[PDB]
Design a protein around this ligand. Sequence first.
Ligand SMILES: Cc1cc2nc3c(=O)[nH]c(=O)nc-3n(C[C@H](O)[C@H](O)[C@H](O)COP(=O)(O)O)c2cc1C
Lengths: 143, 143
Amino acid sequence: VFDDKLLAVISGNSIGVLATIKHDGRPQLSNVQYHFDPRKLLIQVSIAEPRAKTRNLRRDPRASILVDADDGWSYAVAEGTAQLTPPAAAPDDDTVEALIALYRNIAGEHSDWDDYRQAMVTDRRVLLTLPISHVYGLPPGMR
Amino acid sequence: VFDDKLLAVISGNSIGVLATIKHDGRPQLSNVQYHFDPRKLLIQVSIAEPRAKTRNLRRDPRASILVDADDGWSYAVAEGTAQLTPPAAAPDDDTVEALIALYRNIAGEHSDWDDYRQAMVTDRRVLLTLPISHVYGLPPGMR
Ligand SMILES: Cc1cc2nc3c(=O)[nH]c(=O)nc-3n(C[C@H](O)[C@H](O)[C@H](O)COP(=O)(O)O)c2cc1C
């Protein structure tokens, strides 16, 4: 039941710190917006192919994400192995579809889906699906 | 030469996400308090002596700390090779004396130093010094 406390932190937020592994083995850090699927215990995020974090995950898919509790001090960290889609290549391909689904979960119903599809392709957007294999941290009550 | 806008972020905060390298190569994350010396350009944090997977810090001290800005997405990341003191073993050893100065830098004059001293020994506290090698991130704008 202790993991339920760590999952709750992840569920109560939409932004976290994604840590990837550089070519030299050193950690690389950045923040990302995300959607947490409690059903499959997945964390879904959108990223760009040319970005460092993306090139890192292509060589080494291991990833972790730290998320702060609402007190801004307590936290939970999800660790797992990323599953990336190829980059959007056409406004109607499967990657763009999964990204349309994510956007709905993050921001809601987009206004100009056609413009969105165009943008996903222009930015070579990739959907990062990170199944949670292990969670650690210091959830509220422990800090 | 680092981006002054990125250093301002670090100097305007006191907590961030520390990332060290575990044995398997995965980063180990946590929310920590830090002190930033803007002249010597270094960051100092207090940590229990690492055990198990986290112990790898002793042979591969490369670390990074991400610090959040006050706006929506801005953040800075300080990268460097950490130097570690030996773990605190005596309420009055060099390490504890060093952690007292760290506490003063971060919080100020402590109520009861004798409690602090024994607490440092009890947690096998180590003073980690991260001289800044590289600084990256997303700089905040005029606000
Ligand atoms: C207006 C705005 C919207 C953003 N939206 C997202 C987003 O939807 N998802 C995400 O993961 N990051 C988002 N970001 C931030 C980037 O992910 C972040 O700056 C990035 O991690 C750079 O990574 P890199 O250093 O690995 O290239 C946004 C930033 C801004 C300024």
